[PDB]
């Protein structure tokens, strides 16, 4: 179906403990494929997926050059943001950037992204039109003015519509064994007595890829949204993900409850019941 490529970047200042730490990672869908950490002994961008390893020395040289330049630019930007927000040089601050693209089943661009945050809050974002900016505050407006003057949006558009789509297409082909395989959830329901009066029914989804999934509980066919404990989708460590949804059920009412599972790896949504 549809696919995405994203590069994530984080710089964290640490006054008195050297220069800001820079960590960047790249993803295609929910698969990590490249990483760079400025605190590594000999910082280079490193492969994290088999299908990127085949890229030649010049690929890794260019990537590493970009990562190092980005770390440097982020350092200067952190200094700039202290001025923009009238902040002292004493505290730790964070700068985050993500850009990338989504493509449809036919490999066409669905949309591009480029967006920054400072200290965990939205700062400036390229709009969907890939031509205009949303600035969060009067500080980001200073950046917006500079970026409008330098026609930054135009440059980003060229990359997002061009390379970004083209290299994503390449990666999807080279990693077609994994990137184009959905692993469906392995599902079951467990029962956990709480008291004489009630028990927890927990609906499990395990071993699935990609991470996107819907797990819901119904009682007599009615969604139990406000009564369902739904944990965040979590990594297993083997590329796959896990999730559960739990409801507290009165004694003897178990069969009135059904768990419903939607995942792209499933041809039809599943319905599960507690089976003693």
């Amino acid at each position: 179906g549809s696919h995405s490529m994203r590069y994530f970047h984080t710089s964290v200042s640490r006054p008195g403990r050297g220069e800001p730490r820079f960590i960047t990672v790249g993803y295609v869908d929910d698969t990590l494929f490249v990483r760079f950490d400025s605190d590594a002994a000999s910082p280079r961008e490193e492969p994290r997926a088999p299908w990127i390893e085949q890229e030649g020395p010049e690929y890794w040289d260019r990537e590493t050059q970009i990562c190092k330049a980005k770390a440097q630019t982020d350092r200067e930007d952190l200094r700039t943001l202290l001025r923009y927000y009238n902040q002292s040089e004493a505290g730790s601050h964070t700068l985050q950037n993500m850009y990338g693209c989504d493509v449809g089943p036919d490999g066409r661009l669905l949309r591009g992204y480029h967006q920054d945050a400072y200290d965990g809050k939205d700062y400036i974002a390229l709009n969907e039109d890939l031509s205009s900016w949303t600035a969060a505050d009067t500080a980001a407006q200073i950046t917006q003015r500079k970026w409008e003057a330098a026609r930054v949006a135009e440059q980003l558009r060229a990359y997002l519509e061009g390379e970004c789509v083209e290299w994503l297409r390449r990666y999807l082909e080279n990693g077609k064994e994994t990137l184009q395989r959905a692993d469906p959830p392995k599902t079951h329901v467990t029962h956990h007595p709480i008291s004489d009066h009630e028990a927890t029914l927990r609906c499990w989804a395990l071993g699935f890829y990609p991470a996107e999934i819907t797990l819901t509980w119904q009682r007599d066919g009615e969604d139990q949204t406000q009564d369902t404990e739904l944990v965040e989708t979590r990594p297993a460590g083997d590329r796959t993900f896990q999730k559960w949804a739990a409801v507290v059920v009165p004694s003897g009412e178990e069969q009135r409850y059904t768990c419903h599972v939607q995942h792209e790896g499933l041809p039809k949504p599943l319905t599960l019941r507690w089976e003693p």
Binding site: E63, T73, D77, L81, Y123, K146, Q155
Partner: peptide, 9 residues
Amino acid sequence: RRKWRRWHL
């Protein structure tokens, strides 16, 4: 692969 150009805030 990553974008080559970049710009200061």
